[PDB]
Each structure stands twice: as structure tokens, then as C-alpha cells.
Structure 1
Amino acid sequence: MAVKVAINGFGRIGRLAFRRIQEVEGLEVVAVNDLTDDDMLAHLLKYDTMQGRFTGEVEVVDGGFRVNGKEVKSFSEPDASKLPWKDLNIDVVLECTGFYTDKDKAQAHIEAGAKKVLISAPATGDLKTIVFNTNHQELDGSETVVSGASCTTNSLAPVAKVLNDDFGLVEGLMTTIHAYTGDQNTQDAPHRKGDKRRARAAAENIIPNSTGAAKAIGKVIPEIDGKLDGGAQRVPVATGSLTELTVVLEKQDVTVEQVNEAMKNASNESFGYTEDEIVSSDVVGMTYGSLFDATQTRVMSVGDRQLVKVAAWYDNEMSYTAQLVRTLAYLAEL
């Protein structure tokens, strides 16, 4: 009766989703797929630079690894259509490799025998893009393939919803000052996808780049589709990020206190509120999808014309992972 989860891709999100599922009753990881040996998988689960030691016991066994007494099967299969998801009774696959970010591509898990697939990134094709606590109620239970959107999209959506519901959004630009990620290079080097900026030493530069929220957002809140755009500056922190959003609103006698009060009223398990002068390392490990920071709200007025600026923090690892596990549990509950 526990929901049976398989994780394809045991990278940052895969491993972090495994950690969260250990704490969510009714969800169990029964299988992991990754192109590496089990000694490596167990070790990276156990030790984690930014997120901390895993509490429980992890041991490598012949067909997998035991975690707190439970067996986790590990496979090493690179065509996802060959995975034994049918023999193992998989309810949901968390698709975290980065190589199946499309509806038709992802159906390989479904051919293989899983009941549903949640992609841990924006994805192309005929599927719903879901930010828990913003549009998860769009899910009616008939879905086989779903996108969990991106980390930034998750930090943005509940802020952008309040702005548009309460004040009316005319248009806005976004910058996420964003931690470096695994697909950035350690040293100046040819990048795989030809990105001359992701080619550069990750932890020695401010590096302009694209953000997966720039397009994902309109799919999440359709009534502002086309009204927001922006990008990222990848900077030398290993996790922890900040979304700055600069907007023109319909209402035009808006104040700092009006904006702050409205965000607070919308706060919930996915959307936090803070008036403390925190910095990025202070959100490491947090499980809100977004943390609105009242100390950063700015309102600029020249005659009848206002620009409004807001900021929301997120652990681009754990915020995103917690959002994705919330979607997982909900997707499996109907």
C-alpha cells in the first residue's frame, strides 16, 4: 500500500528526492537507475557537501543498497524502455536524468511498466506543468506524464500569482541570482550543449544565463502567459538562490506595505514569508518552494507611474525537491 517510487538519475535532485521520501509516510523508493556503481550511489547518498550527512544507515548489498533496513534495487540501464518497472510494480518514476524532458520521450517508463512519470524539469509535449500549491489542483488523476517545472519557476509562481490576483500584472522582468549547478564546468572547458558561458569555471565567475522559469511560468499561470521574461546570473555559491522580479502593475498607488501584507496572507507550506535580513546560506535545506523576503520590496514612483520590485529566496536543490515530492504524493493520491 506504500506508493512505490523509482528514481531514474541519482544526481542532486534524484538523491535529494530519495532523502525526502525517507520522511514522507506512504511513499517508498524501491529502485534507482543510474550509470555508476552502487558503492558510488551509497556514498553520495550518505555524504552531501551542502545538505549534510544522511541520518540513517546505508549499506551496499549485491542487488542494490539497504537503507534503514529496506532494500533498494539499483539498475544500470540507459534505455529507459528496458527497465524492469513492470516486475517491480512501480507506481511513479521520478525522471531526474535530464535526458527525457519531453512527453514522448518519457513514455518509455510507461512502456516499461510504471503507472506514471513525474519529470523533474520543464518538458515539451502534451503535459501539465505543475508548481505545488499554485496549480497542482489542475491534476485530475488521468495523467501519465507530468512536469514538475523548474526550481526558479517554483520560486516565482506564488509571488507572481499574488501580484496578478491582487494588483493585476501588466508586464515584468526577472533575474535569478542563482547558485551554480552540476552542468556548469569546474574549469574553463568545452561545454556539451555549446553554451560559451556554461563552459566557464563555475565558482570563479558571475555567469549570465537562461532560466527555465522564463517559459514554464505561463504554463503554470496561463492568464499571465507572455507577460514575464528574464534570466539568471550563476554565481559562486553551491546552493541557495534569489529571484528578483521587476513589475508594472494595473493598480498604480501601490505601497511596500500593501505588497508585503498580500504575500504574507498567501503564505503556506510552499510559500514562506520573512522580514529577517537573511542571506543565501540561510535557506540551505529549506522545504518551502519560495521564501518571500519583505526586506527587499521596492516601489519606484515618478508621477502616475510605478515600478515595483520583489525578491524571493529558494534552495534551488531542497525547495525544488520538496515541491516535487509534494506533487508526487498528490499525483499518487487520486
Structure 2
Amino acid sequence: AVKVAINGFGRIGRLAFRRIQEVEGLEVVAVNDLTDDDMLAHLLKYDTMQGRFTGEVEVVDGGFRVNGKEVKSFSEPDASKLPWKDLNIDVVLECTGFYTDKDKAQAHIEAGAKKVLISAPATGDLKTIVFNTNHQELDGSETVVSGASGTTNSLAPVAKVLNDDFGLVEGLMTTIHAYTGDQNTQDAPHRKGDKRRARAAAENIIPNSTGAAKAIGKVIPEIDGKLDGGAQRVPVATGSLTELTVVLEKQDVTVEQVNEAMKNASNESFGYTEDEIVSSDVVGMTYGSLFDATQTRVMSVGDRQLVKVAAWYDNEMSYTAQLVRTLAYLAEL
């Protein structure tokens, strides 16, 4: 089995862990964060939105035991000092939010790990992977890799069908997105100086930025520079929706043509629905993106068309299933 360390046992780290339980050839041997074992153990076991952890968890000496298997824990905020050589780590899942750079992430490798898969977009000379859109670009020699963002994962397979079947001229996106842990509970100073992320997360529609559309060319180079957009953080604790408005090259585009094109591209990563669902219906789903055929619109004025589509994602679990697929694929090369 591939030996995994999880750095940052936060929302993604912990759900990556739950997910790795359902995956042969992957084993989490170690976990690092900034808290005690009791806390780590407790947060794995109970999850507001994702539900009770099905197995058994107990705090032991080196960390905690999950279903008889011992997971070692650490409390070391500087990664370069983790005992990854001593532990024989194949891959570190980098989930802290603080090592989102090819150069910053290289500290795990100095610590003894063989690879680092970052749970976020990341700066620097590395590949950005959405599984089932461009994971074939990995040859397994890579040491640092980005699993992109929940939003990119929602967007990529939608954008790829649109461009392959119709020719993407240009488009704009808004993600209506669950609030995340980088937002305040109450209006308070925000450490990045962001006046909107400063505000009470569960009491507001909050406009915010996201590089998902700007940087999409890292995943689909042929549409590099053709999309942009941002987010509206809103009071659901998880569950998100990506809206994409586009101009296409193809001329007499109908709703049915778009939907059929989308359905034909469905797989484990890209789902397709025609049910009138809402966000809580995607909590815990493992599709990276779920195309909502009910939300497709075609605006036509003479020969000129604007096409709009929308895809659901559990920004938590959807992203986490994608990340773990990329992990397994990366491990296997």
C-alpha cells in the first residue's frame, strides 16, 4: 500500500482521510496539524455536514487508532521538520492552505517524502490536475502537483465539452458557493485584509474572488485566457453551484444540444442530472462536478447567442473524491 501523510487535518484533510478508507493501496500512516490528539480524533469522528464517521476511533499514545490501524500524529507547524523519511511517506497530501507554492511545498520533500499533492491551486513550475479532464498529463515523475480547487473541478469538464463541441469564444462565471473556514463567524479583521471575507459568514451574500476561471488554462490550455469570474459566498455550510455564461462559435445551439453533449461526457467525475435538486442534495457526493440540465439556457437575438450552464459540487466531498483519485493515479506511476 502507498503510504500517505496528511498535512493539515482540516475539512479537506479529514475527508481525504475518510475517503482513503474506501481505497485499496492507500494508507494514511501519519497526520500533522496544530492541536492535540483528542481534538484530531474528535473531529474525525463527528462532522457537522458530512455525518458521523462510520468506524471506530480512539486516542492512543502516538496519535489515534482508526479501526484497529494506528495513525501517528504530529503538531509541527514547520513541514521541513516532519519525520517523513523515518515514516517512509510516499505522498503528502498538503491540505493546510499554507504551502500552496511549488517552492513552499518542497519542504515535505526535504523532510523525506517522495511526492506532494497540494489540495488547492498552487503557484510555480508544477502541473494542475482535475481528474478525468487532464490527469493524463501526469507521467509519475512529478514530485509536487496541485489538485486544483473545488471550483476548477466543477468547471473543467463543463468548459471542455463546451469548447470541444461548440468552440468557446469567451465566458464569465459566478460560483454561488458555501462559506468556508477562511471566513469569519462575526464581522472581524481578516488576516488577508479582505473586507468581504471579514464579514459574518452565515449572515450574508458575500462577493469574492476565485482564480478558477482565470487560471483554467492550466487544466485546459486551449482555452487559456478565455474565461473569468468570481464567487458569491452564501449561508450554506457546504454545497456550491457554478454558473457559466458563454459565447460559442457554433451557430444554432439549442438547450438539448448542450445537455446531450454534457450527458455524453458523463463518468465517475462528471455527473449529469435532470432532477430539480438543491444544494443539500449534493452534500457528500463524489462527483467532481454534477451538470444540471434543468438550468441550461440559450439566449438568441438574431444570429447571436449567449449560452448558460450550471454545475453543482460539494466543494468539500466532490473536491475530496477528485483529490483522492488524482492521489491514487499519481501513486500508481
- Give yes or no for TM over 0.5: yes
Farther-moved stretch of structure 1 (212-221 vs 144-153): 212-221
Is contact 1:129–1:216 with CA below 8 Å preserved after alignment?
no
How many angstroms does 1:217 deviate by?
1.1
Cα distance in 2 for partners of 1:167, 1:12 equals 37
* 1:13 to partner: Cα distance: 0.2
| CA distance, structure 2, for counterparts of residue 56 and residue 108 of structure 1 | 33
How far has the Cα of 1:18 moved from its partner?
0.3
Q: Distance in 1 between matches of 2:288 and 2:210?
A: 16
* 8 Å CA contact retained: 2:30, 2:73: yes
Does residue 92 of the first structure (1) align with residue 91 of the second (2)?
yes
Following superposition, the deviation at residue 276 of structure 1 comes to 0.3
- What is the deviation of 1:207? 0.2
Cα deviation digits, residues 256-293 of structure 1 (max 9, x gap): 00000000000000000000000000000000000000
Look up the match of 1:11. Answer: 10
Residue by residue over 1:201-231, the C-alpha shift from the partner in whole angstroms, topping out at 9 and shown as x without a partner, is 0000000001131333110000000000000
How far residue 133 of structure 1 moved from its aligned partner, in angstroms, is 0.2
Q: Is the 8 A contact 1:288 1:322 kept in 2?
A: yes
Structure 2: how far apart are the matches of 1:121 and 1:67?
Answer: 26
Q: State the Cα distance separating 1:78 from its structure 2 match.
A: 1.1
The CA RMSD over aligned residues, in Å, is 0.5
Instruction: Provide the residue aligned with 1:165 in structure 2.
Output: 164
Distance in 1, Cα, partners of 2:207 & 2:103: 31
Contact 2:287–2:318 (Cα < 8 Å) also in 1: yes
Tell me how far apart the structure 2 counterparts of residues 174 and 143 of structure 1 sit (CA, whole Å): 31
Q: Within 5 Å, which residues of 2 pair with 1:63-78?
A: 63-78=62-77
Q: C-alpha separation between the residues in 2 aligned to 1:89 and 1:276?
A: 46
Would the aligned equivalents of 2:215 and 2:224 in 1 still touch at CA under 8 Å? no
- Structure 2 CA distance, aligned partners of 1:296 and 1:238? 22
- 8 Å Cα contact 2:246-2:308 kept in structure 1: yes
Matches of 1:26 and 1:71 in 2, distance apart?
16
Distance 1:105 1:243 in 2: 30
Q: Distance in 2 between matches of 1:11 and 1:167?
A: 40
Within 5 Å, give how 1:87-236 maps onto structure 2: 87-236=86-235
Q: CA deviation at 1:124?
A: 0.4
User: What is the distance in 2 between the residues matched to 1:257 and 1:230?
Assistant: 25
Residue of structure 1 in register with 2:237 after alignment: 238
Q: Distance in 2 between matches of 1:192 and 1:30?
A: 32
Q: Percent identity, aligned pairs only?
A: 100
- In 2, are the aligned partners of 1:155 and 1:314 still within 8 Å (CA)? yes
Partner SS for 2:171: strand
Contact 1:33 1:74 in 2 (8 A): yes
Counterpart-to-counterpart distance in 1, 2:53 and 2:272: 28
Contact 1:117 1:146 in 2 (8 A): yes
- Deviation per CA, 1:28-73: give whole Å up to 9, x if none: 0000000100000000000000000000000000111000000000
**Structure-2 separation of matches of 1:234 and 1:42:** 29
Moved more, 216-225 or 235-244: 216-225
Return the offset for 1:142: 0.7
SS in 2 for 1:159: helix
CA displacement at 1:232 relative to structure 2: 0.2
Match of 1:291 in 2: 290
Counterpart CA distance in 1 for 2:77 and 2:235 is 32
Q: Is the 8 A contact 1:175 1:232 kept in 2?
A: yes
Shift of 1:129: 0.2
Which residues of structure 2 form unaligned runs of 5+?
none
Query: What is the TM-score of this pair, normalised by structure 1?
Result: 0.99
Cα offsets for 1:118-167 (capped at 9, x unmatched): 00000000000000000000001110000000000000000000000000
